[PDB]
Symmetry: C10
Subunit: 75 residues, 10 copies
């Protein structure tokens, strides 16, 4: 158990690293949203739900990382 439990804990730490992509990704989507709206205010009702979709899809990949982390931590 001891070496295996230790591996799970190290593993759970390693598995959060990929969350960096969601962190950068979410920001990239919101940067585009802010730049697009500032170039063309009239487009905001159109581009805002693309921003919400984009952020959610990007966050999803981070959530897959987190899921593996929790399965290691608690499973």
């Amino acid at each position: 158990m001891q070496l295996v439990l230790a591996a799970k804990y190290i593993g759970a730490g390693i598995s959060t690293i990929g969350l960096l992509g969601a962190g950068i990704g979410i920001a990239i989507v919101f940067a585009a949203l802010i730049n697009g709206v500032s170039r063309n205010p009239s487009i905001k009702d159109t581009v805002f739900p693309m921003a919400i979709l984009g952020f959610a899809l990007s966050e999803a990949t981070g959530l897959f990382c987190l899921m593996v982390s929790f399965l290691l931590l608690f499973g």
Copy 2:
């Protein structure tokens, strides 16, 4: 088997790291969509399905990462 289970769990942690690319990638596809539509609203119906295709192809690489991760956790 202690060493092998340990290695399976470390390895599953490690195979989520690659998801950072789909995280960044999906975001890049949505940012282009946002900037594209704001420059030229009339193009929206043309470029939106391209965004869907882009996101899905970028996501697939992260899903491969996760597939290995699940194979190491359960296979």
Copy 3:
């Protein structure tokens, strides 16, 4: 018990790495805010609440990393 504990400490160091994403992320949101406002100052009240949401959502991923880190530390 010592091996497990050693692994809890390493794992905790490792789970902060992901916070780099929020570091760059928050910055990217605020950079667009500054550039957007400078190109079009009248858009400020519109894009400021968007920057707050952007930063919050980006920070949240970093906060997930830190949650794992603290779960491992205690």
Copy 4:
């Protein structure tokens, strides 16, 4: 054999990391496609096959990583 097998699983995890290049890359190709089409809608039939070519070639790099991964998992 336990150390060797251990190494094989650690190795398989490691060899998905390079898939992040394809996750980001495929996205860069789709972003250019979206941006090019929004700048110049008439160019769409020309630039779309280039996007398919760019994506398949970017994806091939991630597939090489996954192949090495599967060689480690099952061989």
Copy 5:
């Protein structure tokens, strides 16, 4: 004791890596500030507080890393 101590020291070093995100992030914010002031000098007093805020928030994430690094060290 020696295994645990060892892990605390390695873990402490590992938790400084995430600080690369604030190093890049802070810079991105100040670059946006510079590019925006040079495009539009009259906007200086509006975007400056935005840059302070954005820097503070980027930095905080690097500070959560240092915090974990200090917990492991002390």
Copy 6:
């Protein structure tokens, strides 16, 4: 034998990491091709061979990584 074999397998996995550079690089080349053709469609036949060359050369580096990975495997 077991230690050496072990290292060959870990080393083989490690040498695929560098392939992320070709994955990004190839894409950068094709994006430049797309942005340049859409700005200037008449340039298509000039820049296309340039993109093939640039892709080939980016890819080669990922292939040197795979080569090391295959040597370690076989």
Copy 7:
């Protein structure tokens, strides 16, 4: 004590990695300064102190890494 000391030196090496954020960051600030001054030479006296501020604050992050490094090397 040998394992502990070992760990201290491995740790000290590890804690210089984060200095790459300052190496890139300081450069991003100087690049903006150069580009801003070439677009608008009259803005130089305004944007130069902002560049000093941005750089010192970016550098401070690398210095925190180096401090942890020196704590590991000598304490």
Copy 8:
């Protein structure tokens, strides 16, 4: 002798990582070439020999990584 050899194989896998730099690097040179030529087609004969030098110098760093890799493999 087995431990040393194990380390030669791991070290060799590790030294290919740096080749990612040349992967992205070569691509960045060729992207600028394509964009430069599309903006200004008459500059092609001037910027093509610059792209060749750029790619060569970038590849060379990758070749240094591979040299270490082969020195370790034999």
Copy 9:
């Protein structure tokens, strides 16, 4: 001492990784200088010393990395 010398040598290897930032940083300062002068040749004498300052501050972070590396190899 076997373990400690081993750790010193691994650690010295690891503390060079941070030099990748000065590598990228210096380049970013020179790229801005190049793009700055080409947009506005008259600015050359103004922005060139800024480039020198930029490069040197970016390089210093890599020199800190190397300092630790030498301390681990010889100190």
Copy 10:
């Protein structure tokens, strides 16, 4: 000797990683050179030696990495 020699060899592999920064950096300088010359052909005699300086300074950081690698490999 055995564990120490093994550490040096692993260390020498780790120390080439930072060469990735010179590889990207050198390219960034040459990209700027190519973009600057294509915007403004008359500037080429001015910006070319800044490109040579930039690439050399960037390559220098990679050479510091390589130096540590050779000291580990052969020292």
